[PDB]
Amino acid sequence: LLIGVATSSLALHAPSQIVAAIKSRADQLGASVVVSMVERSGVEACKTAVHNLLAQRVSGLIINYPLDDQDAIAVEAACTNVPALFLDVSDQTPINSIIFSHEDGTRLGVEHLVALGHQQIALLAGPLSSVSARLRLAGWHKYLTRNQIQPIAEREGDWSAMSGFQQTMQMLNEGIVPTAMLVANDQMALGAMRAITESGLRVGADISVVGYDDTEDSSCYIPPLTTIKQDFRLLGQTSVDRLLQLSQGQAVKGNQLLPVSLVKRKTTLAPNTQTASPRALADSLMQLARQVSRLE
């Protein structure tokens, strides 16, 4: 009983909250989990990661890493005879896998904003060289389409807070001031939020943001982020588990999806990028002047 976990960059919270979640279930079942982090590169990076664990004489493999249909299949055979469960793959590729409904994920985000009266929605996607990053972009460009609305913007980030921050100062330094944004994860929305703020914009009221994952700090990110949840606590549960099932005789086989949901919090409101004021705002500015000349 020695579960091998070939995971992402543990810098990112998700691949981390997942491992914690894994190590946690293997705990009660009474099995041992052993991590092997895997490089930024791809396919072959993952392969060696795989080989290591194979050497430790692991029992089965949970591959938490981005792979294209083709790559996934490669890696599977790399494992030779050990049963390997895949966590970040197309919900189409043959291999055994557990995926969060990328279809429901986007559908919810999209429809929540539309109902809220938003029309000018901008998209901040993850690193398009990542299947999961790719499948949410798709679902965005579908559920907004079926709703008739079209994305006034589209950026590419990389799962970091800074990435979401730059791509949002960029988008705003050239004229696209929307009323809502669909971000590919919670860290990018964190940065995205500071962005929208250092710009005189009220997050939520002026620009509604909706993260995606609902990692831990998301509750405390200033406006407690309205985010789509991915229960990794329960993803590891089902994972370690099914992994046992495949090895110890049977299985279930191939694609198996889990649900997601809209954790409605505080970054999403009626469009109204604020309307009105006569010379009320003139009277406002007026005082700051006193204040400023109150200084020099």
Ligand X SMILES: CC(C)S[C@@H]1O[C@H](CO)[C@H](O)[C@H](O)[C@H]1O
Is residue 169 a contact residue for its own copies (CB under 8 A)?
yes
Q: Which does 277 bind (CB under 5 to 8 A by kind): its own copies, ligand X, none?
A: its own copies
- Single out the residue of 25, 50, 61, 88 in contact with ligand X (rule: CB under 6 A): 88
Which of the residues 34 through 73 are near its own copies (CB under 8 A)? 34-37, 39, 52, 56
Task: Lay out the sheet containing 180-183: strands in order across.
Answer: 153-156, 121-125, 180-183, 208-210
Q: How buried is residue 104: exposed, middle or buried, by Cβ count under 10 Å (0-12/13-18/19+)?
A: middle
Rounded to whole angstroms, how far apart are CA atoms 204 and 121? 13
Q: Which does 69 bind (CB under 5 to 8 A by kind): ligand X, its own copies, none?
A: none
Shortest distance in whole angstroms from residue 100 CB to ligand X: 6
- Single out the residue of 119, 120, 147, 166 in contact with its own copies (rule: CB under 8 A): 166
Q: How buried is residue 278: exposed, middle or buried, by Cβ count under 10 Å (0-12/13-18/19+)?
A: exposed
Question: Contact region for ligand X (CB under 6 A) — 12-20, 108-116, 250-258, 283-291?
Answer: 12-20
Q: What are φ and ψ of residue 240, in 5° steps?
A: -45, -45
- Single out the residue of 5, 6, 12, 53 in contact with ligand X (rule: CB under 6 A): 12
| Count of residues of this chain found to bind its own copies when the rule CB under 8 A is applied | 75
Nearest CB to ligand X, comparing residues 206 and 213: 213
Distances in whole angstroms, Cα of residue 146 to Cα of each of 47, 105, 224, 269: 40, 15, 29, 22
Is residue 8 a contact residue for ligand X (CB under 6 A)?
yes
Nearest CB to its own copies, comparing residues 175 and 249: 175
Name every residue whose Cβ is closer than 8 Å to that of residue 237 and which is 6 or more positions away in sequence. Answer: 21, 25
Q: Taking CB under 6 A as the rule, which mask of x and - marks residues 130-169 in contact with ligand X?
A: x-x--------------------------x----------
Nearest CB to ligand X, comparing residues 167 and 185: 185
- The backbone region for 155, taken as left when phi is positive above 0, alpha when psi lies in -120 to 50, beta otherwise, is beta
Contact yes or no for 153/123 (Cβ under 8 A): yes
Contact yes or no for 164/191 (Cβ under 8 A): yes
Question: Contact region for ligand X (CB under 6 A) — 14-22, 67-75, 162-170, 247-255?
Answer: 14-22
Segments in 44-176 forming alpha helices (H): 44-55, 69-78, 102-115, 131-143, 161-172
Q: Which residues bind ligand X (CB under 6 A)?
A: 8, 12, 14-15, 18, 64, 66, 87-88, 130, 132, 159, 185, 212-213, 230
